[PDB]
Write a structure and sequence with these properties.
Elements: E1 8-12, E2 23-26, E3 31-35, E4 43-47, E5 53-55, E6 58-60, E7 70-74, E8 80-85, E9 88-94
Antiparallel strand pairs: 1-9, 2-3, 3-7, 4-5, 4-8, 6-7, 8-9
PDB class: protein binding
Keywords: Type IV secretion system, CagX
Assembly: monomeric
């Protein structure tokens, strides 16, 4: 068992609701993005300090069934993610970044 940082929020662009996760948390090593079965799967990118984007090391975790969602494990902790599928964009903010997962 590892205390989780659940302190994330999403900021969808227009015509972007169809790619939004329902649950996002990190355990200090990995960031987990849970999507409803009905949601289309975006790519997940991280914002770098330069303002530029990077790919992540992301993949479906078949084992995880939490909340009836489709879960992706990202092998990184970051302050900002961009979820992209064609013109659809959701910015994810880790408000708990640099903080301990006690609170």
């Amino acid at each position: 068992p590892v205390p989780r940082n659940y302190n994330y929020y999403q900021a969808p662009e227009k015509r972007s609701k169809h790619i939004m996760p329902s649950e996002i948390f990190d355990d200090g090593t990995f960031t987990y993005f849970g999507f409803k079965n009905i949601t289309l799967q975006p790519a997940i990118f991280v914002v770098q300090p330069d303002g530029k984007l990077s790919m992540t090391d992301a993949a479906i975790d078949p084992n995880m069934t939490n909340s009836g969602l489709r879960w992706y494990r990202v092998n990184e902790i970051a302050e900002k993610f961009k979820l992209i599928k064609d013109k659809a964009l959701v910015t994810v903010i880790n408000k708990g970044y640099g903080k301990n997962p006690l609170t």
